[PDB]
Amino acid sequence: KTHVQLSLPVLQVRDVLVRGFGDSVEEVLSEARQHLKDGTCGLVEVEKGVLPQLEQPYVFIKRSDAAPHGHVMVELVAELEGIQYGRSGETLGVLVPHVGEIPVAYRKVLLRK
Ligand SMILES: [C]C1=C(Br)[C]=C([B]([O])=O)S1
Numbered sequence: 001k002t003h004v005q006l007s008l009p010v011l012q013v014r015d016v017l018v019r020g021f022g023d024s025v026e027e028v029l030s031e032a033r034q035h036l037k038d039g040t041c042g043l044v045e046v047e048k049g050v051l052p053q054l055e056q057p058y059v060f061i062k063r064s065d066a067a068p069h070g071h072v073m074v075e076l077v078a079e080l081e082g083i084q085y086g087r088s089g090e091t092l093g094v095l096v097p098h099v100g101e102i103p104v105a106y107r108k109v110l111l112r113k
Helices: 025-038
Strands: 003-010 041-044 058-063 072-080 083-085 091-097 105-112
Touching: 025 041, 025 058, 025 072, 025 091, 072 091, 091 105
Parallel strands: 003 041, 072 105
Antiparallel strands: 003 105, 041 091, 058 072, 058 091, 072 083
8 A cells, every 4th residue: 555544643742752763864754654654653743842842853744635534645754954855735743753652632644655
């Protein structure tokens, strides 16, 4: 399948224990994809002051289409020092490792793998 239905635990930024996927654009997108597959990926909603509390490179899920079965279609875009690798629609938030933090919600997405 080119696309996978996922339910992502939405985390408060101050609860996040592991605040990034790694050290290069290529590593963060790789690790993001692995954690998404393994169901160990969380989502932090982007607001004023959220991003500076997280580690670069950032991995965003962005809306790729304008919602099969409730699941918003998204794709992965990385950002390092103001440069994005990928081009997509609006940010649904920033992906982070999930290591058992209690979420505040769940975000249903159809991910282009
Ligand atoms: C992002 C990816 C998800 Br979810 C599942 C993959 B697979 O085919 O093993 S790759």
